[PDB]
Design a protein around this ligand. Structure first.
Ligand SMILES: *[C@@H]1O[C@H](CO)[C@@H](O)[C@H](O)[C@H]1NC(C)=O
Ligand SMILES: *[C@@H]1O[C@H](CO)[C@@H](O)[C@H](O)[C@H]1NC(C)=O
Lengths: 30, 50
């Protein structure tokens, strides 16, 4: 449930390296 | 951050760093996006977060 401008904002900004991080480095979810 | 098919295989003697393996065979197991919860049942109503 998003509008047009929200869809554009989500598409424009983009976020194996995470798999490579076996060295005790994790990212928690919000 | 562990798929919850690892802790049931972890149910053994001297096959896990934490000692309290007895609690692995505990209560209803729930799947979340940050791991899996052991010992808490999942109702499907809504409240204010505690
Ligand atoms: C664990 O992996 C299996 C792959 O067979 C998948 O079906 C399941 O949804 C996953 N569960 C969790 C909690 O990651
Ligand atoms: C909530 O969980 C109960 C468990 O038996 C189920 O019967 C019911 O249909 C569920 N309600 C919804 C809205 O998923």
């Amino acid at each position: 449930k998003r509008s047009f401008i929200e869809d554009l904002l989500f598409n424009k900004v983009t976020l194996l390296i995470c798999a490579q991080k076996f060295k005790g480095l994790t990212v928690l979810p919000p | 951050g562990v798929n919850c098919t690892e802790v049931p295989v972890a149910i053994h003697a001297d096959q896990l760093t934490p000692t309290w393996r007895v609690y692995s065979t505990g209560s209803n197991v729930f799947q979340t996006r940050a791991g899996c919860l052991i010992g808490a049942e999942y109702v499907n109503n809504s409240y204010e977060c505690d």
